[PDB]
Each structure stands twice: as C-alpha cells, then as structure tokens.
Design a protein around this ligand. Structure first.
Ligand SMILES: COC(=O)CNc1c(C(=O)NCc2ccc(F)cc2F)c(=O)n(O)c2ncccc12
Ligand SMILES: COC(=O)CNc1c(C(=O)NCc2ccc(F)cc2F)c(=O)n(O)c2ncccc12
Ligand SMILES: [Mg+2]
Ligand SMILES: [Mg+2]
Ligand SMILES: [Mg+2]
Ligand SMILES: [Mg+2]
Ligand SMILES: [Mg+2]
Ligand SMILES: [Mg+2]
Ligand SMILES: [Zn+2]
Ligand SMILES: [Zn+2]
Lengths: 367, 182, 367, 182
DNA sequence: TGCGAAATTCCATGACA
DNA sequence: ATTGTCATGGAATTTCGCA
DNA sequence: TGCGAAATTCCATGACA
DNA sequence: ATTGTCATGGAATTTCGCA
C-alpha cells in the first residue's frame, strides 16, 4: 500500500520502470504493459498469489509464471516464484532431476591376485538338483572366477563355499554389495577370524560390484547357449562354465584369467606354449611384467550438464522401494564429506551418517 | 629337454581310513610335481567314483598333463581310465610294491601324513573342518631346495598367510600318550 | 594334403607368403612365424578346428582366433572364424547387439482436435473406492486429457468410458498399444460402428504411445504430490488432476491444452483475458493460426554406430518375456517391407507377417 | 461491452420424470449460452446431490462464470449455493413462474424435449444408451442465426460426425398412435 | 549505441510398467 | 499394417530500461 | 618407398535383478 | 566408511608381403 501509494502519484520506486503509467481502477493498482493491463498487487499479497498459482498443478518456474502473468505484474516475479519452488516440500521430493551424475571412476586394478575378491549371488535360477542360486567369486586382478551352487543366498552357504575356496589362498579384501548374506555379523566374524577385510558397495548401486556383475553376464550367457534346446539343468554345467570362462581370452588384455593367475596354461585345449623353453623362474618374471602392463581405462568425459557434490550442499537420497503414488526422493540432507567425486557421506533423513553413491542422489533445486 | 612346469604332473594317493569326520573317512592327496602345491579332498571311500568326483572339482580349476599314482584299484579301473582319456590326461602308474615319485613329492607326502597325525590327536573326528588350514600351511611352507613356497611358485607372488612359526611336527610327550590311548 | 604337399617342396601357393620356410615335423606341416612355430592343418581340418576353439566358451571373433593362433596358422584365419560365428545358432540368438537403432521419428502433430486420440491404462494402483486402474485419453493435437477410473483394464470398461467421452465429439482415429482391452473384437466392433479407425502401436514399444505415456507421468506426479502425508485415496482426485493438467501451460508451446481446444479459458484461476475484446469469430480465427504455428521437434542426430533396415536384410526380433537362462532373441528373419526408417514388416519366426519396431530388432551379425 | 463467449453462462434445468432407464429417471440439461452446446447427464432425482454430482463431471472439463436456472429446489438450496461459491460460480435465478433465458437457449431446450420425445416412443426405457448420440445430434445441428453448429463455435473446427439428414422432429402418424397407447 | 540486468529461450535429463 | 514425448531448472541468449 | 590386403586396434553398444 | 565392467563385431588404423 505505502509503496504503491507513492507510485500512483508519479514518484519513482526502484524496480518499477518509469516509462509506464501506473493508475488506479476498481480499487486496484494497475499498469499498462505491452502484453496488456496487469494488476500490481501489494508486496504483502504476492507470496499468496505465487502459492495459489503454483498449487494449481505444482508446476515449475515457467509454467507457474505464465499463470501469474495472466493477471498480475510486479518487479522480479520469477524471483518470488523460485522462492516458493524451493520451499514446496511436495515438489522437492516428487520431481525428477535434470542434472546427470559426474563421470564414473575407473578404480585401479588390484596389483596382485588375491588382493581383492568381488563376490555376489546370481538367482533364483530354475531348480537344478535342488539348487537355486550361484555364489560368484571373481579375483580382482586376474578375473579368475569360482562358481558355487547354493540353495539360498545365505551367510551359511557363503561361509561353506568360501571355506573351500580359501583352501587355496586367503584374500586381503572381499568386496560385496549389501545383500543380507554378506552383512550379517556371522559373516563379519568369519572374515575377522581369517584376517580378511570386508568392503561394501554403497547401497543400491550394483555398478560398485561391476567386476563380478560383468562376470555374471558372461556366466549366464554361456549357460544359456549350452542349454539351448535342452531343459535348464545348469548344476552340472557350473564346473564346465567355470573352466571355460577362466581360460577365455580378453581381447583388450590378450590374456585369459588363468594366464594372469598362473602364468602358464594347464592341459586345456589350445594351450599357449610360448614359454615352453623358459624356466619357471623366468616364466614368473615375465608374468610379473605382464600383470603391471595391463591396459587400464580412464574416466570418461563429463556430460554437458553434470553435477559434483560439495561439502555442505543440500542433496536428496533416492527412495529405495518407493510405493505406488509415493515420492521417489527423500527430504533434503546435507553432504558431510566427499570421499571421492562419486561417493559422499550425508546426514541421513533419519539422522544417521550414510555413505551413498551420487547416482542415488540429486542436488536439491532452487538452493 | 623342457624345464619342469606346474600342471605337468599331478601325484595322487589316498590317506585312510581315518576316524569319521562328518561322514568322511579318506583324504585324496593331490600334489603338483613342480611346485609341490597340495590339494586335499575328503572322500567316503577310496573308490573310482569318489576319485572322479573330487578330481572333477580340481580339474575345473586346472587340468594336469599327467596324473601319477600307484596301482590302487580306484586308479587302475577302466572307468577312471575313460575319465582321464576324456580330459586328455595321461595316466602313469608306478610298479606294484615299488612306489616311485620325486624327492619333493615324497617329502611333501611325508609332511602331510605327519601334519595330519599331529592335529588328529585330541580331536580325531574334527579333521574335515581343518583341511583348509592344513593346505594353507603345506602350501606356504618354505622349500629348502627351491627356496620358494608352493604358493610362490604357483602364483608368482607372496601370500597373505605366511606361516613363520613351524609346528614341531613331532608329537610332544603328552600328545604321544593321548595317541597311544586312542 | 595335396596343397600342403607342393608347399613342402618349395612351390608357391597363393595365400602362403614365400619368405617363410614350410617344413615337416612329427607328420605335420609347420611354419616358422615371428610369433613362433605353428602347425598348418590341411584345408579339410580347419572347419573342425575353428569349431572346437569357438565351442570352448562360444567366444566372438578375436577371442576365438587367439585360441587357434596358439597352435595353428593358415591364410585368412579370421575369415574362417567369422564363417563359423555366422552359423552358430546359439550365439546368434543369445548374444547382444552392438549396433544402436536409427534416430527416432517425430511424427507430425495432428492438425485438428479429435483427429487422433491416444489411449492407455495406468495401474494397478492402490485400491481406491474399489477402483484399481485409470483409463487415460489424450487428444493428439491439444493434449487435452480425460481420466476415467476403472476396476479392470477391460474392453467393457473402455467402451463404457469412451461412450461418455464421445458424447462431446467422435475422433477420427484412436491409437493404443496392443493391450488386451484394445485388441478385442468387441472393441473393434465398437469403433467400426462409430466410424472410428483403430491404430495400434508395434508390439512391446511404449514409445509409440509416447503422447499418452508422457501424460501418464504428469498424472501420477501430481497425484503423488497431492497424496503426500495422506492415504492414497486417488479416486476423488482424478477430476481435480484432470482439470489441473488440462489448464497447465506447456513452456515450449506457451499454451494450455484447454486453450488449444477451446481458444479461451473457462472460469478457472488465473484465466487469460487477452481476447476479451475480440468476438468469438475473431477468437476462433486467432485459434486456427495458433494451432498451425506450434513448435514441432525434428529427428535427432543418428548415433555413430546405428543401423537402418533394408528390404531382404536378416534381422532378429527380441523375445518378449524370455525365461531364465533362455535366449533373448528369436531366430533370424527377413525384412519384407520398410514402412519407415523405424518400422518394418518381417517374415516372423512362426511364418507370419509381423509389423515391429527396429528397437525390438537387431541385425544378424556376420551376414 | 464485451462480446459473448463460451463458458460465460451455462443454462441448466431438469427434464423428467422419465420412464426408468437403467435406474435413471431425470436428465440434467446444460446449455452454453453463447455456443448452444449441450451436455446431458442422467440422474435418479432432481436433487442437489444429483446436480452436484453431475456438474462436478462437467466442471472438471470447463467451469462457467454464471449458472442460470429457475427457482427449483435443487438449485436454490444452501448446499448448491456453497458448491457454486467454492468454484467461483455465480448463480443467477429467473423470477418464479417467469422462466427467462435466451432465444437460442429457449429453442435449444425445445429441440431437446422434442428430440427426446421422438426417440422415447418405441423404446421408452432405453434412453440412457441413446444420450451420447442425442448430444452429438444437438451439438452438430446448424444454427440459422449464427450459421455455425455448437461444435464449430466451441472447438473452431468442423466435426467428424456432421448430421446432414435432419429427423422430422415431428411424430409420424404411427409414432403418435404408439405414444397415445403408452 | 552501449551497458547491466531482467526476461526469455534453450535444451539435457529423466520417466511414462 | 506404422512413427516417442515433454515438464523441469540452470545456462545461454535476447530483450529491456536507461542514457 | 609405395601399394593392396591382411591383421590388428579401436570403441560404441548393451547387460550384469 | 568408498569407486563400473568388458565381450562383441564393424570400422578405423596399422602392419605385412612384395617390389
Ligand atoms: C539398481 O538395482 C538395484 O538397486 C540393486 N539390484 C541388484 C542388482 C542389480 O540391480 N543388478 C543389475 C545391474 C544394473 C546396473 C549395473 F551397472 C550392474 C548390475 F548388475 C544386482 O546385480 N545384485 O547382485 C543385487 N544383489 C543384491 C541386492 C540387489 C542387487
Ligand atoms: C518396454 O516395456 C514393454 O515392453 C511394454 N510395457 C508397457 C508399458 C511400459 O513399459 N511403459 C514404460 C515406458 C518405457 C519407455 C517409454 F518410452 C514409455 C513408457 F511408457 C506401458 O507404459 N504400458 O502402458 C503398457 N501397456 C500394456 C502392455 C505393456 C505396457
Ligand atoms: Mg547382489
Ligand atoms: Mg549382482
Ligand atoms: Mg595308492
Ligand atoms: Mg498400456
Ligand atoms: Mg503406458
Ligand atoms: Mg428447473
Ligand atoms: Zn509444489
Ligand atoms: Zn557359438
């Protein structure tokens, strides 16, 4: 009222351009703008107007302004619109993001065999000999894979299988997702007794176990081919598939996982015989050079509209299993620490510290 | 002549019958000739079926060119011969009553029999669970001749479980009394 | 034998380079190559060798050759490898494609309202007033949307809802996916009685109904926002959501669906009043110009490794619901006709003619 | 003064009671004043509840500025007044016993009553299913004054169902005999 | 004839089972 | 016999208010 | 010192619930 | 407190066989 009063008599007010005529009509301050005559509401009514227009269909910036512009005008309207969008809890937790995650990391290949195992379960598969699942264990450095059929993705089945595997060697680190078989206290005690450090993917991010996931693809692809035109009796094929994949060349590496593990082929078809005249010591010397000269990929280019996390930034975690007609995002949380450009610790929506992947985060819009 | 290599020759033999441990009575011993690396498989009988079942696990990891054994019935059966022929494995038998292997394999099989005896006393029915730690000990044992453990010769790296404290491998006076009682 | 015989005595044979020495040893023809001594098998044995090497793990071109190269050499080995890859039925139907589909078409917006309806079902939703599904009807030209709650995605529920809708106007064409409610003979008879042509998406390709699918997203997004912190009673919100979306501005169009349909806002909040001084005839004249000047997107750039179908080409249709450990692709079929760069008729794996999207096809590898 | 426009004024009235047709006895008639476009809603009673339920369907498509009706109890109730007030709809009533609308709306409501009568005979209990085709006929009827159909004035296009063959709209001699018998 | 800022346009991102 | 679509919010671009 | 062709390398595509 | 991966087959590039 007071601000609009001096505008009616001709005094200049910052934000209101002077070249327009501000008159009164029907008890309302109006202005003749190129798009037409618009009502200038007092400052004390603009928040309610923005809220009424936005709440019609919970529209974004432009779709909300187009509604308001049909009747009203005032300085810096979109500023007030964005101010309401950032305060509408329903939009913040339901809307999608339009900013992609930063480019993926390509973490270093483990230096030695048995430095880091990646493990995961496949299944449920069609029942074969009473078995439904396959425990998959891939050595990070070599890609050498062990297959164990199980009746359940349970801790007890994991421990039994790994007790057999660890008869050959004990790994430094075992990496796995946060499935129930690997997060139980029983499995943690099993690893501590053997000096094995357990490493866990961020939740709901199978990329982090990509080493084994990618092997799972090859396992099921070969099983599918061998089972064409036959009933899905896969139990007896696991040893075949294990041996077949462990002696398959990687075209970019020029070596098989067996070769990276032992430095010499065993009595398998088409065995390589290049080191036949070398001694075992000379063979192992060549093997050490091969392990260190393997091709390693680099981080891809960031997309044109990616975001990277910053300490103190407001971010929102993706809802794990969102119910029907329920929001896909949690309420905003704060980035406590940036472990790497793709991994952060947030002050969780429950109050806890949570280590998550930025693939399961979006930056809260409108700051 | 070509230098000796892993997977050139696997030496196999049965140890048993042992006290029952979770239904198993025998141990199939497999030793790689070049490295001395040892695999142990518990079986319920020294039969061809039990041998084929255990070696199918091992031969899904690595296949030897030659398998060596004595004239035991499980190893001289026509079924086991067909099994080896299907996998391109040549079977090599020692003369009856004249077991012949190598100094390294002889001493390795000696260590296995002695290490099992030292751990059988006090818990003769719990050796099935101890088979993993037994192989780790055997395969991370320093070789005086080659100056490398079987683990080092097979994988070309050091191990994450180096066994520095050697068991006496000789039964203590109290362990001898408990073994005579059993 | 005969070809390899003249090679042993020093005569030149095409394909075998002359600068190498071809000798005999252990009853086998061999050659000293830079990588080592390799066996030269006779022509009559090379197919079996390629097959044995490939069948170890059903590997591709390079991974199969690396096996063969460990022992053998002969002229143009990869040519024989590719010849076997193109004949291995298990690989052709199990392997993935590495050629992307051609760029999407952006079909013309229908010229007039009621020229083409797009219809589809949403659900099952949480039970609200005994209802589980929502029939969605979007006019192609305007985007104006009608919402009907149903207890099942059935033909009877579709006919009842469309009989009410068609009280206002009859559309020329109704487009829908191949769901059961829209493909029944009862629904076909219903449309023929009213002069309505039924148009169907290619199977398993919701992109083709993208007009309604995109509206389904907005419908569920607004329902989610309105139901935050409340039980999911969505039945009474359908009329609200319908009105709210029909009067929401599209920022790229600068108009609401209601405006594109009627040319004037009704008594809704923030109604536009720009044509208040025009007559209805002048209003409808401006509306006709607006309908013809709407922004239309164009075909995006093709990706660097895309494929486009050609008449007579061997292609494979994606398996609809592939069972566990079963191939993801059907046996090769032939392209009969190219309706557009993204749609073809194939001689189906059952012998029938099938109109499919190239998104559900891959080109058969190795010709 | 501003030219007349669609949605400026909706004229509403009840027709009935009619013979029962799938449980419905009345028809709520809604006519847009400017275009003459007609919406028909079957109800079971001329009550406020039935009126609000039917107009909630229509007002989810378009909201009028003014609703006009006579002094019927369904329209003058405090509940219906609150319903209109919640939607920003002004209610406008004609003087009791003096129904007033417009020439176009008067003639349109005349056509509706006559078209329903012509189709009631022979099948007086099957008018619920015929309501869609009745509205299409009414809304695609050429207007002598405006020289455009309601469909054309409301959507600004031609229709896909142009009604060129007009029903006689006068009962044939045989239709009159069957109506007198009923 | 040019400046700083507001307003408009652009468009990558993601979801419709 | 058929075919993706478009709300969203930071960024890039254009226009505006003034001189 | 250069040519045609074979061989090797490159790398976008897609799937691991 | 953690992090994508790699077989695949046309295409692009390099090497080979010969002169
Ligand atoms: C995105 O999917 C998820 O949120 C997690 N799903 C699992 C997946 C999963 O979704 N795998 C698919 C998949 C998607 C993207 C990738 F980059 C890798 C994958 F394996 C999984 O492979 N395993 O082993 C799981 N194990 C336990 C619990 C969940 C999963
Ligand atoms: C790829 O998913 C399919 O094969 C088809 N699924 C359906 C989908 C579906 O998968 N929708 C998701 C979806 C994915 C990609 C798109 F470009 C649009 C979509 F709606 C659907 O929306 N409707 O309505 C269906 N109706 C009947 C039968 C199937 C669907
Ligand atoms: Mg998992
Ligand atoms: Mg997995
Ligand atoms: Mg023996
Ligand atoms: Mg559908
Ligand atoms: Mg759909
Ligand atoms: Mg009345
Ligand atoms: Zn909102
Ligand atoms: Zn194959």
């Amino acid at each position: 009222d007071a601000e609009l009063d001096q505008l009616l008599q001709g005094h200049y007010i910052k934000g209101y351009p002077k070249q327009y005529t501000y008159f009164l009509e029907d008890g309302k301050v109006k202005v003749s703008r190129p798009e037409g005559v618009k009502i200038i509401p007092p400052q004390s009514d603009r928040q309610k107007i923005v809220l009424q227009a936005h709440n019609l269909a919970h529209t974004g910036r432009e779709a909300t302004l187009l509604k308001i512009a049909n009747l009203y005008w005032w300085p810096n309207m979109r500023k007030d619109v964005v101010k309401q969008l950032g305060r509408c809890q329903q939009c913040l937790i339901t809307n999608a993001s339009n900013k992609a995650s930063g480019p993926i990391l390509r973490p270093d290949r483990p230096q030695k065999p048995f430095d880091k195992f990646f493990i995961d379960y496949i299944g449920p598969l069609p029942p074969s000999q009473g078995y439904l699942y396959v425990l998959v264990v891939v050595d990070g450095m070599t890609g050498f894979t062990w297959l164990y059929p199980t009746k359940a993705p349970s801790t007890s089945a994991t421990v039994k299988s790994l007790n057999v595997l660890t008869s050959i060697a004990i790994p430094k680190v075992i990496h796995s997702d946060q499935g129930a078989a690997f997060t139980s206290s029983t499995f943690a005690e099993w690893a501590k007794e053997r000096g094995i450090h357990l490493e866990f993917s961020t939740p709901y991010h199978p990329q982090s176990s990509g080493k084994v996931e990618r092997k799972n693809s090859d396992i099921k692809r070969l099983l599918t081919k061998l089972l064409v035109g036959r009933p899905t009796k896969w139990y007896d094929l696991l040893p075949v598939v294990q041996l077949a994949l462990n002696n398959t060349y990687s075209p970019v590496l020029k070596y098989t996982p067996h070769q990276l593990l032992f430095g010499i082929d065993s009595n398998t078809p088409f065995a390589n015989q290049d080191t036949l005249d070398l001694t075992r010591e000379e063979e192992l010397s060549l093997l050490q050079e091969i392990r260190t000269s393997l091709y390693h990929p680099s981080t891809p280019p960031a997309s044109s509209r990616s975001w990277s996390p910053v300490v103190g930034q407001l971010v929102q975690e993706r809802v794990a299993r969102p119910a029907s007609l329920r929001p896909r995002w949690h309420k905003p949380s704060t980035v406590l620490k940036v472990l790497n450009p793709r991994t952060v610790v947030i002050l969780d929506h429950l109050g806890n510290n949570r280590t998550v992947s930025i693939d399961n985060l979006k930056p809260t819009s409108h700051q | 002549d070509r230098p000796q290599k892993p997977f050139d020759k696997f030496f196999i033999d049965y140890i048993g019958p042992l006290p029952p441990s979770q239904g198993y009575l025998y141990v199939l011993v497999v030793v790689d000739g070049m490295t001395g690396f040892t695999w142990l498989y518990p079986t319920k009988a020294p039969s061809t079926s039990a041998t084929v079942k255990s070696l199918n696990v091992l031969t899904s990891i690595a296949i030897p060119k030659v398998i060596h054994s004595d004239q035991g019935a499980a190893f001289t059966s026509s079924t086991f011969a067909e099994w080896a022929k299907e996998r391109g494995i040549h079977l090599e038998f020692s003369t009856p009553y004249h077991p012949q292997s190598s100094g390294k394999v002889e001493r390795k099989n000696s260590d296995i029999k002695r290490l099992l005896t030292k751990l059988l006393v006090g818990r003769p029915t719990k050796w099935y669970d101890l088979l993993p730690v037994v192989q780790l000990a055997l395969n991370n044992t320093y070789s005086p001749v080659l100056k490398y453990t079987p683990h080092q010769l097979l994988f070309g790296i050091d191990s994450n479980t180096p066994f520095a404290n050697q068991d006496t491998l000789d039964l203590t006076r109290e362990e001898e009394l408990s073994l005579l009682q059993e």
